[PDB]
Specification:
The structure is cut from a larger assembly and holds chains A, B, C and D.
Chain A: H1 2-17, H2 24-38, H3 48-64, H4 69-89, H5 101-118, H6 120-126, E1 138-141, H7 145-154, E2 162-166, H8 173-181, E3 187-191, E4 204-207, E5 211-212, E6 218-221, H9 224-233, E7 238-240, E8 286-289, E9 296-299, E10 302-304, H10 306-316
Parallel strand pairs in A: 1-2, 1-4, 2-3, 4-7, 7-9
Antiparallel strand pairs in A: 5-6, 6-8, 9-10
Helix pairs in contact in A: 1-3, 2-4, 2-5, 3-4, 4-5, 6-7
Chain C: E1 14-21, E2 26-31, E3 37-42, H1 57-60, E4 64-72, E5 77-81, H2 87-113, H3 119-134, H4 143-149, H5 166-175
Antiparallel strand pairs in C: 1-2, 1-4, 2-3, 4-5
Helix pairs in contact in C: 2-3, 2-5
Chain D: H1 40-50, H2 57-73, H3 83-101, H4 106-120, H5 128-159, E1 167-169, H6 175-185, E2 192-197, H7 205-212, E3 220-222, H8 226-229, E4 249-251, H9 255-265, E5 270-272, E6 301-302, E7 305-306, E8 325-327, E9 334-337, E10 340-342, H10 348-351
The chains are: A alpha/beta, B alpha/beta, C alpha+beta, D mainly alpha.
Subcellular location (chain C): Cytoplasm, Stress granule; Cytoplasm, Cytosol; Mitochondrion
Modified residues (Phosphoserine) (chain C): 44, 47, 153
Domain S1 motif (chain C): 12-83
Chain lengths: 324, 293, 176, 353
Amino acid sequence: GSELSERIESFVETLKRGGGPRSSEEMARETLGLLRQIITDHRWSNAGELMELIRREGRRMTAAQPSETTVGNMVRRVLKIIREEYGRLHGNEDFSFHYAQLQSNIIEAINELLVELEGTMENIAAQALEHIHSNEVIMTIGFSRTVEAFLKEAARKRKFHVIVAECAPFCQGHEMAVNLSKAGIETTVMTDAAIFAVMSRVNKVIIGTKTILANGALRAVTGTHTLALAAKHHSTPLIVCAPMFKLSPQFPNEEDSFHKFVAPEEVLPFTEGDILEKVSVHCPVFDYVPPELITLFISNIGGNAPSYIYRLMSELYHPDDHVL
Amino acid sequence: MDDKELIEYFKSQMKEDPDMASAVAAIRTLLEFLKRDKGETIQGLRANLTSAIETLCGVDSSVAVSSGGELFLRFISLASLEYSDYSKCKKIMIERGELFLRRISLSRNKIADLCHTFIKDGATILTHAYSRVVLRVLEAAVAAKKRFSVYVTESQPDLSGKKMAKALCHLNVPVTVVLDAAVGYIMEKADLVIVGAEGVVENGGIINKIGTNQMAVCAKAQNKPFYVVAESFKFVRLFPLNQQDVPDKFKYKADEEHPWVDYTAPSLITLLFTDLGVLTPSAVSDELIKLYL
Amino acid sequence: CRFYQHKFPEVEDVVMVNVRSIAEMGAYVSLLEYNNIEGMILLSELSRRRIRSINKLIRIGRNECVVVIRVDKEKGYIDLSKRRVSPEEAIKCEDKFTKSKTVYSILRHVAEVLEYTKDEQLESLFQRTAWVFDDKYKRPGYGAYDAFKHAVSDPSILDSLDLNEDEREVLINNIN
Amino acid sequence: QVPTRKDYGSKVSLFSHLPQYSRQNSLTQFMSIPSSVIHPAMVRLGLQYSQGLVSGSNARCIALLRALQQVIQDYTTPPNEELSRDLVNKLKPYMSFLTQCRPLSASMHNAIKFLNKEITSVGSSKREEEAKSELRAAIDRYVQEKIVLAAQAISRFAYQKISNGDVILVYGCSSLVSRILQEAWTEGRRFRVVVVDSRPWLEGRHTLRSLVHAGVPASYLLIPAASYVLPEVSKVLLGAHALLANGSVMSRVGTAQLALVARAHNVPVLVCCETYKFCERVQTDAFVSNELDDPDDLQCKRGEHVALANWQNHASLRLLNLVYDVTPPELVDLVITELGMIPCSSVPVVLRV
């Protein structure tokens, strides 16, 4: 049915134009709902033809927005699901050994994955209380709804200061701090020009992240590199509160347009005037935190050093799917 | 095989084929010895393979030879051979061995095709000494239509830097020899450092040519990435802790002092390049426990 | 000497062993029945759980029985195996091992009681004893077994060893 | 219902969660003598935990397992109530009581986890006597493999590194390091030792005795003088009351400080532990979960007067003696376990099986 075609096309259009939906978990859930729709409304009987199909949409998607690693690695994971179920049932060539039984199993596995994907905020939130010992000064940055859920869960049984830098290109730290203080955390907004002066007085640095690569190194909302570099100069322990699907298996310099440059209007508004002729304004939104400044990923399975993250690739994505 | 035409088979395998690595040569010799053994007993052959490893490592004691010997020794026997006549089970031995040799042969091209996607063009690769792995990754980088400068050291004992410079300017890539002593100087203008590692100890560090450690620590100071290329017939179960603990059987490769290798910690290394993939240098240990099983 | 009557163990014959060293190819096991048969039992594919073997030395020292498969008396190597052995064979080998250990302890008491301080002396004594014992019925090492079984009437009808008198008293005092 | 041991003093500001217990008010005060609500082995164990009679991690685990063996021995069963779930149902209270007496360390966590997994996984199709005897044999197999054989494997791994002439350093009454040094000096390697000890529990004298009774040269010095001897020290061989899920070695309260001053003096720091202590949780800083002893044992008898003689009166003087302390995985150069001489950061990838 062409309904799948129009749905996929509307999806990739929304991805190119402007984030849809906004919440990263919501985008992963939407990607999975779409991918399930492909496994109920297309022509396939083999497994190899379905892997080619999934790659033929995943290439389009991961080339639409090179910084939407969520949908990319979600397609990678459904590919891994295909590999696993086809190999367990029939079994390196993929043959059309059998039929719809495989599809029922695939739909069931995708339903399980989607259920694990929708209840991850609550997992990390229940994992908070063990980490936020009372009277900390937890320095976040930006607005990452997982970190807000983490903190306003942990502050239901303890008390701690919460510095929050705001992202200076366009301030979202403000909304995070407002949502925090509506739960009474004694939070402290500030512009992130002062991450180094007000770091010596910080106990633990709790940052979200947009995407975890396969070095452990991540790609997180801008100015978080310098926050991590300070919080390693002051050897405070970072905490990358990222669920497990914000995990692409690329590698740091194996990606061009790593960042995501947005309309330089936000950095130097058009109202400025003539001097907008001889100035190259850069508005990088995402910055590349190397893996040796991070300390402890807080994923839905528990805490993990960065040196365990590579193993997660070997347990989530197939080694021949790192090119989608 | 009375260990005299065996060492000569090894030396002739070297002299005839000059480009091929040392460990793969030792494993080819050991597999040829597996075939021409004239003994139908398995435990009488495992001891034979050990004695053969010994008479090889006696002449060319590179860490590669012993690493590959143990890898061979272990990989020829995985499944339940269920020794019946020691002939069909030996056929399983031999087929697994030839498969292993296939993988050892294609590993180098795998390394190139997996790594040369990290030399962002207009950079300045700095390398230490001649090693066909870095040479092949640069060859299949400039074959992917890129351009970059390459500084090569000298490595004073055997100036393999000059040889690398020759065989690298042979490809219209701007090459430069630069005093190994000056590894601290030009380290200011090398956006990354590539060295081929002739040994991968358990923790992640590398046992490489003499000048590797100082380069690793300089490039860690000024925060230049230290990419190391080293493959699965070079994983060593060793585990030193200071440059004094690399066993003396390797440090001289012969029998005012100066060694021929040295250790480099798993903190000064940015990313290992193995045929198993690209590994955070803490992956060497899980991959070694795994590969070895 | 030897537990079974043979001077070297024979092909396709189950025995017991104590492991000595695990390694790459296989796990060495010392069959303490035919003069320390150092047989390197095969390592399987899924038996290669030595990856995460919790304290591998937990298996390095024990008593486990295996069946010989391929043997060669040029390097003295006796490859064993433990894959498709049935529990009836297992219990039979255990009973044979118990009887053989009893016979070996009796023979060692005879040796250390007969001034057989020289190793060749114990060799000849145990060989003569085991020959005259298990050759009268073509039974594998059942001399002391049948002796201790029929020891309610007469356990020393095979006492044609006209050398020592402490052997008979020791046999009749131990089997009683 | 078993009461709640009441705290003692005022926990420091950053410790509104870790309880501060004293030794004087043993919980036994509010329990019957023919111990009724719990089993007598459990109260005996909790009471020799409280008074601080069982110190090391391996020792705590061994004693706890003997206690559990006793409990199983005198276990019986309510009618039509399956033993499978019911044993855990009745073993959780004793665990909470032990937590009251002195919080379950990491070794006890692993041990009770193993035992509960074993209890839930034994089929209801067994007789009482047979299930009990099988459980006891399994616990004994545990003690033999995880903590007794592990010592031998670890000694055999470590002996291949202890060269001749190098002055290995230690810390605290760590059973495994004393065993290593005994078993590697009764082998031939002539070396020295330099024990480092730490008030208020001078738990360094234990390893000092257990070493000099075995002929080893030695030297003893308190922990703050560490930065003095490290010029000569040529290895370091700490302990581990846990290994968290990222390599950060939890220990006594001096191990991190030693690892740090050691790296600063550039000497290898090779903590050795057994595969069972490797826990599942992970903590980064030394405050999210610890233990606080009776602080009143800090007061040292100087001159003629204990300088902290009266301690509760000064409302602006609050005491603490942390018991546990986390060294980060960038200062560890080795974790010797039976599963190998694994390196620091790659403990979770390789020991989660």
